[PDB]
């Protein structure tokens, strides 16, 4: 609660959008296991063991 600074506020907000990075950090988590996981398989389901 402080003076009529709102025209601040939007900009600050800009600030807080780091949120929209850490959102994804689980994501980012969950990628880097597909991959992992894929390099096998994507590399296994080249000739199979037939």
Known sequence: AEGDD????????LQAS????????????????????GIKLFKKFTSKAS
């Not at 959102?23 to 990628?31: D, H, I, Q, S, T």
């Open 6 to 13: 709102p025209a601040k506020a939007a900009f600050n907000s």
């Open 18 to 37: 780091a949120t929209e990075y850490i959102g994804y950090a689980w994501a980012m988590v969950v990628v880097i296991v597909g991959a992992t996981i």
